[PDB]
């Protein structure tokens, strides 16, 4: 008999003041939270953010909504959420978020006989995640999502994860083109602003960028060109045209491939690691050309000294390049 | 009791005229303001703007909302704000502003027994900042946010910073990859339009641009290519093809340099510092090539004069380039 249920619902909402939290003037109301992650679409290095779609569900007991005589869960139309008190939960590190509204607003209100209220939403958010790209592309990131009450302090509302470490689900099925999720963590704490102490929940993922075709295509050409630039020392004074052609080719080819590589790197204006590596390779080819120039100049007056300098370079250049590669590997790998 | 508080609030809102400001027809209402800066998402030179997320808090007194019998501060629901008088504060230099609305409108209303209203909003605004790129990338940018009352003149409303120089916090939370904040300032004044005089508050920031990326990517390659261009002065006339190849290589590489961040700048009519440096380097390389052409043309009939020209150039060019660098870095820095 839907008439009896309608009478019960109208009686519950009669004299219901939405401007007062449950147990107003008394103990704080405990709100439990569950998150079901659906996808993580884009983790933008340029914009320093990531997109996240979730089913966000909250639970709280309200004594004003306790009904008797109906032994069933009452799943009400989502518009009833406009007549009930709901927590003012918000995210602190989001830049633009929306609740889906097709075909209707994705919102769920479920009342239980003991006054328990379950309030569910489907939310797509763009959360800010600062990144330390100084180790690009061998970088690791820690992206967090923060949850807090906007108006009620810990004297009025308390947050907690409903289910301990098994509250947030679906992270394992999340797949990304670049990164791979290694760990996720849940934290509950209190944050003290100048207005008071508010509850805080934090869901933090750790991402590790993959390694593949791009790692080879950004180092191997440059190191191969730098290695090939050392054949200049083993060429005698005869066939010096080959030496000049080799030096010019190394310079031109390295510059061309460096530009065609930087055309694909993320457009952020600060010093990464690959940029320093490419600068080091360019400095090496420049030094090789300068050494060739000096040897050629002093060749006529002191041929023995020029030959000795070439012999010295034969050992010096690979050793210094290996030493610099070792330093780079220690500092940035 | 909840019913008693509900009755008190209903009595407060009963017979309340939202259309009339507090003390209508009498003294102006004093509004204090606080800003807590969450972050600055981006600072764009193409569109000449910057994105700013903040908590904006306003403080005023409305004697019509004064209540007695409750020794508590009523932190009410956000929707209650729709039934009160709030100032018409707006930002004169904003282009797209919105209040975050997930999971609810990030709005806070707090009433006090003295009839004192505190009203908090979480606002993301894209403010318009006009930039002088004459010294790019060695420039400082002063970006302001203007806060003004739209409909109420100085006879109706007054603005001030609540707390003084400490009214704006969260300045240290701002992290920009290509900028570093130097200083922030608070200004209070009056602005006169054809419709009357209005109060005005101003929050100013002075950002400084990071130079490390530009030194790594622009200045060092150009200096290295300019140095490489001088190699031809130490080459004998018998190796004329080497000199031609060296000059052509230097010119081509100088043209190739600095194609990394073309799209992230507007179409300004003037000339920037980086453009000046690139033009100077290109002029030096072109002059070296022209000197080679002149020497090769004249060396057949006047070998001694060509030798003198080469021996003078190999000293003049490095000195001239050093003087040019001295003038550049003494003027712009």
């Amino acid at each position, epitope marked *: 008999n839907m008439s009896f249920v309608k009478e019960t619902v109208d009686k519950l909402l009669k004299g219901y003041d939405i401007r007062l939290r449950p147990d107003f003037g008394g103990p704080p109301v405990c709100v439990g939270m569950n998150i079901d992650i659906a996808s993580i679409d884009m983790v933008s290095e340029v914009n320093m953010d990531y997109t996240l779609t979730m089913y966000f569900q909250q639970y709280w007991r309200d004594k004003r909504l306790a009904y008797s005589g109906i032994p069933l869960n009452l799943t009400l139309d989502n518009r009833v959420a406009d007549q009930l008190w709901v927590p003012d939960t918000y995210f*602190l*590190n989001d830049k633009k978020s929306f609740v889906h509204g097709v075909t209707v607003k994705n919102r769920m209100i479920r009342l239980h006989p003991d006054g328990t209220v379950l309030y569910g939403l489907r939310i797509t958010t763009t959360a800010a995640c*600062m990144m*330390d790209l100084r180790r690009y592309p061998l970088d690791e990131q*820690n992206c*967090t999502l*923060e949850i807090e009450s906007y108006g009620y302090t810990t004297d009025d509302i308390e947050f907690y994860w409903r289910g301990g470490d098994k509250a947030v689900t679906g992270v394992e099925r999340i797949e990304l083109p670049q990164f791979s999720i290694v760990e996720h963590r849940l934290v509950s704490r*209190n*944050v*003290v*602003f*100048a207005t008071g*102490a*508010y509850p805080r929940l934090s869901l933090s993922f750790r991402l590790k960028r993959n390694i593949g075709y791009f790692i080879l295509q950004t180092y191997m050409p440059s190191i191969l060109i730098t290695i090939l630039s050392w054949v200049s020392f083993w060429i005698n004074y005869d066939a010096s045209a080959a030496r000049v052609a080799l030096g010019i080719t190394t310079v031109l080819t390295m510059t061309t491939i460096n530009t065609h590589l930087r055309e694909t790197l993320p457009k952020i204006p600060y010093v990464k690691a690959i940029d320093m590596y490419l600068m080091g390779c360019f400095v090496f080819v420049f030094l090789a050309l300068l050494e060739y120039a000096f040897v050629n100049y002093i060749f006529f007056s002191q041929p023995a000294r020029a030959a000795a300098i070439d012999r010295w370079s034969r050992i010096v250049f690979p050793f210094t390049f290996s030493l610099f590669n070792l330093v780079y590997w220690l500092y940035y790998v | 009791n909840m019913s008693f508080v509900k009755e008190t609030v209903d009595k407060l809102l009963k017979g309340y005229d939202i259309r009339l400001r507090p003390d209508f027809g009498g003294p102006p209402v004093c509004v204090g303001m606080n800003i807590d800066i969450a972050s600055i998402d981006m600072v764009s030179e193409v569109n000449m703007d910057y994105t700013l997320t903040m908590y904006f808090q306003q403080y005023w007194r409305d004697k019509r909302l004064a209540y007695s019998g409750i020794p508590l501060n009523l932190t009410l629901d956000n929707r209650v704000a729709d039934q009160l008088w709030v100032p018409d504060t707006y930002f004169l230099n904003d282009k797209k502003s919105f209040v975050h609305g997930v999971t609810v409108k990030n709005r806070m209303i707090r009433l006090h027994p003295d009839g004192t209203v505190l009203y908090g909003l979480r606002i993301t605004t894209t403010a318009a900042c006009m930039m002088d790129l004459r010294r790019y990338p060695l420039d400082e940018q002063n970006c302001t946010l203007e806060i003004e009352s739209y409909g109420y003149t100085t006879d109706d409303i007054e603005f001030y910073w609540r707390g003084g120089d400490k009214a704006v*916090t969260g*300045v*240290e*939370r*701002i*992290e*920009l990859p290509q900028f*570093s*904040i*130097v*200083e*922030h300032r608070l200004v209070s004044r009056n602005v006169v339009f054809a419709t009357g005089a209005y109060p005005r508050l101003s929050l100013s920031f002075r950002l400084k641009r990071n130079i490390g990326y530009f030194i790594l990517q622009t200045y060092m390659p150009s200096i290295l290519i300019t140095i490489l261009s001088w190699v031809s002065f130490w080459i004998n006339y018998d190796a004329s093809a080497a000199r031609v190849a060296l000059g052509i290589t230097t010119v081509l590489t100088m043209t190739t340099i600095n194609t990394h961040l073309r799209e992230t700048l507007p179409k300004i009519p003037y000339v920037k510092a980086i453009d000046m440096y690139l033009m100077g380097c290109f002029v030096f390389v072109f002059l070296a090539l022209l000197e080679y052409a002149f020497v090769n043309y004249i060396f057949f009939s006047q070998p001694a004069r060509a030798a003198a020209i080469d021996r003078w150039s190999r000293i003049v060019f490095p000195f001239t380039f050093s003087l040019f660098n001295l003038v550049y870095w003494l003027y712009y820095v």
Partner: nanobody
Amino acid sequence: LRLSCAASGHTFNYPIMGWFRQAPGKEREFVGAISWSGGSTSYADSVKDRFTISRDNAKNTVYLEMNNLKPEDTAVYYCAAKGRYSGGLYYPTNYDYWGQGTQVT
């Protein structure tokens, strides 16, 4: 004098360093705070124009220079790290990791 706070580990997740002083009869109180890229050296009112805080990421150190010492300056000093979204700056509860105490006469 000149105190130095040096951080080791995941320093990027805690980009704000703060100084606190504790008296024998009073709880720890905020003195200064520095952001690596925020450029806003925040100071307490009692230590304005007398203490200075500088930063350097070359070895990830924060320098606290003290000038015009007073008898009330005798307190044990601590250095603490604060998260990116940890809230207020003047409140010791928001800081996760703390440094060993140091005495100044």
